[PDB]
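Obj: model holo form, ligand = (1-methyl-1H-pyrrol-2-yl)acetic acid.
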Amino acid sequence: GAMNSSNYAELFNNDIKLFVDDTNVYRVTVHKTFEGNVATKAINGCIFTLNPKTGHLFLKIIHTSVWAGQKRLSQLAKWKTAEEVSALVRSLPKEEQPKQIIVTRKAMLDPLEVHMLDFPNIAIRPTELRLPFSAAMSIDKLSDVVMKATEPQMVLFNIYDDWLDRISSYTAFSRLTLLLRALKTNEESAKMILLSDPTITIKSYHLWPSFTDEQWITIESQMRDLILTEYGRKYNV
Amino acid sequence: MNTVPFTSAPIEVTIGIDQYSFNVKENQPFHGIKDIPIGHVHVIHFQHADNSSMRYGYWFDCRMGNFYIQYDPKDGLYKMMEERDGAKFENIVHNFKERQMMVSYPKIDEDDTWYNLTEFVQMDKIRKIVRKDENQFSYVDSSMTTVQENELSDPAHSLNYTVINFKSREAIRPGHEMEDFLDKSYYLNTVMLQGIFKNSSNYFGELQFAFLNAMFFGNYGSSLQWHAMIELICSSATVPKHMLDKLDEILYYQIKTLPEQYSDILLNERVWNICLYSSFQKNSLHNTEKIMENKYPELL
Ligand SMILES: Cn1cccc1CC(=O)O
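Output (holo structure tokens):
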């Protein structure tokens, strides 16, 4: 059924699974019209579909043209995301298809279940984890490819860079979620932490800087501090 | 007017006939029910005084044969049987009437309740839902499961209602998933009405039969079927106007007849609130919405 802290290690077993996060599919700026009414302007979004064991990220870029002339866009966005995950599964060889898809928001359950009727053996599950995948658009190279898109496009990334050469997928997922939680709580400071040192760079083929193991321990500590600091600023503690 | 004689009443029992009921004491001189209206299906049903477990009963149509009830002490229940010897049957009934050992089907002349509950219910369709082809009448009880229940276990003893499942390939066309899942008109009109039921009368007949088995036997799978067939209509944007008007009448009489004290178990809060207040047909069921709001405002 639902995925939580009691079965957390299941994420890193050898059954192929994907997280699907739809929080950046339908994105808008709200603004005043000349008449002083309010209107929205859509901007490009993305589906965040992630294999937590391998780091493989299937980023479907959602171009604003997909909303043209459509009504009830927030409801349409769940079904567009569900249609996109289903053509993603169908495009994969059978031995690469997931056995489970975990949606980060419960409102995605029925749209995805309906798209995946043809795959009765793929389990569609919610989670009780509060995962920070909305902050994917705070990763500069992901944000860049989304905003530059002039048409629908799928771009593949490894969100763990080369970390799995040195650490396990449990530890890599933990590092990722801490990085994304920090970027979500205070983007400016998180990005300051990550790039403060000009001598550590981001390889062309990577998303994050090339930290040594010791530097990652330092970075990870600074990210926890940032989260605790913001928690204190928030609640006055 | 037709008659269902009883050989005897050896165990104390509450006997139902359609929406009426009466108590018979152990070994009381009871020999049946007379003045049963011709032209309608009927149901005669039983709840034993010493074990209210298992309500059970028999759907029948007196135009299709001469039926009587006889207690079986081995299987421990009142059984319906057909008497093929017509002159034997007439002679038995006339004797029991002369000695006034029969209750009269107690219909008030103003009262169309039973017609209104069974308008589209036909014995031939009952016998396809309840498969036991050697008898002209059909046995139903509290515990019988439906074909759909058995999919999610004896098939001979099942209620073969039409399977309705909103998250099924039958309900959802390849390329129209959002339109079909949010607007069930395709499923209602093409798949069910044109495809399976052939017309709205057969659809309403199954809906009415499901309600009646839920109410008279507390049959849980029948209650699921009744609600699913309502929800399917209410969740369709495109429904013929005559169907909506008839559905409002059907449901009105069903809600009117429901025992007030059983509303908690026979009515699904989610389905009724969705149907009356959120669905495409939220404004199309005026009679049903008015009786629901005045009789069961707690549910809403
Ligand atoms: C194809 N599509 C994508 C979002 C909504 C739709 C329409 C539908 O599935 O009936």
